[PDB]
RNA sequence: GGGCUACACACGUGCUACAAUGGACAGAACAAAGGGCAGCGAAACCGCGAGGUUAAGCCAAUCCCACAAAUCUGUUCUCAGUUCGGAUCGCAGUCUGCAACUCGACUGCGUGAAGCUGGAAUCGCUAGUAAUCGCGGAUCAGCAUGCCGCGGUGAAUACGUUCC
């Protein structure tokens, strides 16, 4: 479990079912299915005994789950050892793309708490 | 038994030429594998630790036995009684029927894994390994178990030195990170 | 950036060129941080003009497309009162 | 690929085998082609 | 420093992008409409003075 | 060259959502007003896209910006952190500009925060008003969730001056 992207779900149509794969998104799924000719097909999981394999190969050409996590990880590790400034933003809790800090930007900062008063 | 015949014809003769042996006949041999559960309870009230015990029957056909604690712990449950984890000691033909599933199927299935075990050797002989998923073992169904439980394997080598114990494993086809 | 291409002011170009062909002089200040690192520029160490003080910067093989002035932050950290 | 062993089930389909897995099968490119490209290879004219 | 600023502007910029708009009647930069190159206040006072047709004010 | 964009946090004010009166796809259909020659730039072609190549016409009730969007008609998902929402970030491109690191915009791909309607408290509005959907302009090399306008769809309630 499973034949291609590991741990694809069940009782869902195939396109959203492999969008869950850490790699393929929506439009990429539209492309791999355009190569497939499945036409959707199948709402549940019942494709075909061999077509599941040929799709397994095309998905195999795409790459790849936790190693793709290793791509981003090795990339940011490349972005910290380089000096730096971008990875510096990655670990300050500072947003990296460049969008102030005086308000909001809590996506990294977190909620609580507060430690100031006047007067 | 195919793995069992494999060292009787392929591995041993190659192993014999790699270095000298006293009294010719001598050769390192696998002894026992010990699979640990641990579970971790969290906290004591599983409530059914035995449900985890049933799961290990799938990983290996030998019946698991719960390991009752012989010492109390201030940090976690519990004083003696109410066993934590389980243990298995498969042997004989079961030994290589299980190891054949390990190299051919189990280890490659893991996501991030590519190879391990470098400093892992005791310097004496015994091999050790950690197992963090039931997906690793093909016989288990995905629908069962749900929440993950941990697992262990400890191959034993007859050889008195790790340098011999390691070389025996390499010819078995055991993966190494290198 | 865009295409054709990354843009040094061009004085740094002839400077690092002369420093590469001969002399092998090390540590030089620059005010023009806008210039991108180049493969010919590799291994040099430049004092970067943040404004307040020049910050020396070695160039590893890994850095090229990043801006030369990016590595030195003008900003002073943090500054905050009661840490921990 | 097929393998003759023993189990509670009379038949066992299996998604992955050592003869198919890229690591056990020599050093197949599979999908990588590791290190392409690093740490630098960026030039365009 | 408005004299220095208008002196800065009337002189040709090293780059064409540099030329920000400003009214002649007053040396204040910023908030100057480009189409008429007048101050909002410059155009205000001229509006009470009345420089162009017509109606004036707040129709439609 | 920086900084005016700081960052442990507080507050004011907007935007987007927390979804089946919905999401997504396909087809079909109705605007107003404004801007345009150092400009608008059709059509044809190249690129998945952004845009690019090339170039007709227009000093404009002629031509261009320009396609209206909600809606309607069907297909599909069937109640969940979801085909809900889009954050954050990575990679690869693109427009403007001597030049996009600080500190620009946009696109393709990938990643898929929080949030399942919000305490105390508080604001607007008596009809084409509230509700909501798109468009244009001033600003302007580039940058408009802000501001100023344009039109589409379009209600509920008003017993009354006890009380604020």
Automatic annotation (TrEMBL), chain A:
GO terms for cellular component: cytosol; small ribosomal subunit. It comes from the Bacteria. Keywords: Ribonucleoprotein, Ribosomal protein, RNA-binding, rRNA-binding, tRNA-binding. Pfam families: Ribosomal_S13 (PF00416). GO terms for molecular function: rRNA binding; structural constituent of ribosome; tRNA binding. InterPro entries: Rbsml_uS13_C, Ribosomal_uS13, Ribosomal_uS13-like_H2TH, Ribosomal_uS13_bac-type, Ribosomal_uS13_CS. The keyword Cell membrane does not apply. Gene3D superfamilies: 1.10.8.50, 30s ribosomal protein s13, domain 2. Residues 92-119 are annotated as: Disordered. GO terms for biological process: translation. Residues 105-119 have a biased composition (Basic residues). Located at the top of the head of the 30S subunit, it contacts several helices of the 16S rRNA. In the 70S ribosome it contacts the 23S rRNA (bridge B1a) and protein L5 of the 50S subunit (bridge B1b), connecting the 2 subunits; these bridges are implicated in subunit movement. Contacts the tRNAs in the A and P-sites. Part of the 30S ribosomal subunit. Forms a loose heterodimer with protein S19. Forms two bridges to the 50S subunit in the 70S ribosome. Belongs to the universal ribosomal protein uS13 family. PANTHER family: 30S RIBOSOMAL PROTEIN S13/40S RIBOSOMAL PROTEIN S18, SMALL RIBOSOMAL SUBUNIT PROTEIN US13M. This is Small ribosomal subunit protein uS13. The lineage of its organism: Bacteria, Bacillati, Bacillota, Bacilli, Bacillales. The gene is rpsM.
Automatic annotation (TrEMBL), chain B:
Part of the 50S ribosomal subunit; part of the 5S rRNA/L5/L18/L25 subcomplex. Contacts the 5S rRNA and the P site tRNA. Forms a bridge to the 30S subunit in the 70S ribosome. Keywords: Ribonucleoprotein, Ribosomal protein, RNA-binding, rRNA-binding, tRNA-binding. InterPro entries: Ribosomal_uL5, Ribosomal_uL5_bac-type, Ribosomal_uL5_C, Ribosomal_uL5_CS, Ribosomal_uL5_dom_sf, Ribosomal_uL5_N. GO terms for molecular function: rRNA binding; structural constituent of ribosome; tRNA binding. Belongs to the universal ribosomal protein uL5 family. This is 1 of the proteins that bind and probably mediate the attachment of the 5S RNA into the large ribosomal subunit, where it forms part of the central protuberance. In the 70S ribosome it contacts protein S13 of the 30S subunit (bridge B1b), connecting the 2 subunits; this bridge is implicated in subunit movement. Contacts the P site tRNA; the 5S rRNA and some of its associated proteins might help stabilize positioning of ribosome-bound tRNAs. Residues 83-176 form the Large ribosomal subunit protein uL5 C-terminal domain. It comes from Bacillus subtilis. GO terms for biological process: translation. This is Large ribosomal subunit protein uL5. It comes from the Bacteria. Residues 23-79 form the Large ribosomal subunit protein uL5 N-terminal domain. The gene is rplE. One of its GO terms (cellular component) is ribosome.
From TrEMBL, chain C:
GO terms for biological process: ribosomal small subunit assembly; translation. One of its GO terms (molecular function) is structural constituent of ribosome. SUPFAM superfamilies: Ribosomal protein S19 (SSF54570). The keyword rRNA-binding applies. It comes from the Bacteria. GO terms for cellular component: cytoplasm; small ribosomal subunit. Keywords: Ribonucleoprotein, Ribosomal protein, RNA-binding, rRNA-binding. Belongs to the universal ribosomal protein uS19 family. This is Small ribosomal subunit protein uS19. It comes from Bacillus subtilis. InterPro entries: Ribosomal_uS19, Ribosomal_uS19_bac-type, Ribosomal_uS19_CS, Ribosomal_uS19_SF. Protein S19 forms a complex with S13 that binds strongly to the 16S ribosomal RNA.
UniProtKB/TrEMBL annotation, chain E:
One of its GO terms (biological process) is translation. Keywords: Metal-binding, Ribonucleoprotein, Ribosomal protein, RNA-binding, rRNA-binding, Zinc. Its cofactor is Zn(2+). One of its GO terms (molecular function) is structural constituent of ribosome. The keyword Metal-binding applies. Binds 1 zinc ion per subunit. One of its GO terms (cellular component) is small ribosomal subunit. InterPro entries: Ribosomal_uS14 (IPR001209), Ribosomal_uS14_bact (IPR023053), Ribosomal_uS14_CS (IPR018271), Ribosomal_uS14_sf (IPR043140). Zn(2+) binds at residues 23, 26, 39, 42. HAMAP family: Ribosomal_uS14_2_B. Belongs to the universal ribosomal protein uS14 family. Zinc-binding uS14 subfamily. Binds 16S rRNA, required for the assembly of 30S particles and may also be responsible for determining the conformation of the 16S rRNA at the A site. Part of the 30S ribosomal subunit. Contacts proteins S3 and S10. This is Small ribosomal subunit protein uS14. The lineage of its organism: Bacteria, Bacillati, Bacillota, Bacilli, Bacillales.
């Amino acid at each position: 479990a499973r034949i291609a992207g590991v741990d694809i779900p069940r009782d869902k149509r195939v396109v959203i079912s492999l969008t869950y794969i850490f790699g393929i998104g929506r439009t990429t799924a539209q492309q791999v299915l355009k190569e497939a000719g499945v036409s959707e097909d199948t709402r549940v999981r019942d494709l075909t005994e061999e077509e599941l394999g040929k799709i397994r190969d095309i998905i195999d050409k795409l790459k790849v789950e936790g190693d793709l996590r290793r791509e981003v990880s090795l990339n940011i590790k490349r972005l910290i050892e380089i000096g730096s400034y971008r990875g510096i933003r990655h670990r300050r809790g500072l947003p990296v793309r460049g969008q102030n800090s005086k308000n909001n930007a809590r996506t990294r900062k977190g909620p609580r708490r507060t430690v100031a008063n006047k007067k | 038994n195919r793995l069992k015949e494999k060292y009787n014809k392929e591995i041993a003769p190659a192993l014999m030429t790699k270095f000298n042996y006293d009294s010719v006949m001598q050769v390192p041999k696998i002894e026992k594998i010990v699979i640990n559960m641990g579970v971790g309870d969290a906290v004591q009230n599983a409530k059914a630790i035995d449900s985890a015990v049933e799961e290990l029957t799938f990983i290996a056909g030998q019946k698991p036995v719960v390991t009752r604690a012989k010492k109390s712990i201030a940090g976690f449950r519990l004083r003696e009684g109410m066993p934590i984890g389980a243990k298995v000691t498969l042997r004989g033909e079961r030994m290589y029927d299980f190891l054949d599933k390990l190299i051919s199927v189990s280890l490659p299935r893991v996501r991030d894994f590519r190879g391990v075990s470098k400093k892992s050797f005791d310097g004496r002989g015994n091999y050790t390994l950690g197992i963090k998923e039931q997906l690793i073992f093909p016989e288990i169904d995905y629908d069962k178990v749900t929440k993950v439980r941990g697992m262990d394997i400890v191959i034993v080598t007859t050889a008195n030195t790790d340098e011999e114990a390691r070389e025996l494993l390499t010819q078995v086809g055991m993966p190494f990170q290198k | 950036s865009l295409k054709k291409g990354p843009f040094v002011d061009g004085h740094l170009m002839t400077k690092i060129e002369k420093l590469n062909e001969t002399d092998k002089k090390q540590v030089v200040k620059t005010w023009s941080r806008r210039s991108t690192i180049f493969p010919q520029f590799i291994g040099h160490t430049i004092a970067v003009y943040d404004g307040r003080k020049h910050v020396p910067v070695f160039i590893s093989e890994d850095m090229v497309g990043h801006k030369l002035g990016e590595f030195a932050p003008t900003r002073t950290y943090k500054g905050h009162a009661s840490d921990d | 690929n097929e393998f003759e062993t023993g189990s509670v089930k009379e038949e066992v389909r299996v998604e992955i085998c050592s003869e198919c897995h890229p690591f056990y099968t020599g050093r197949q490119k599979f999908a990588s082609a590791d290190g392409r490209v690093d740490r630098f290879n960026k030039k365009y004219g | 420093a408005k004299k220095s600023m208008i002196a800065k502007q009337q002189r040709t910029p090293k780059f064409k992008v540099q030329e920000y708009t400003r009214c002649e009647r007053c040396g204040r930069p910023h908030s100057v409409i480009r189409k008429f190159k007048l101050c909002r206040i410059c155009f205000r006072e001229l509006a009470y003075k009345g420089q162009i047709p017509g109606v004036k004010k707040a129709s439609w």
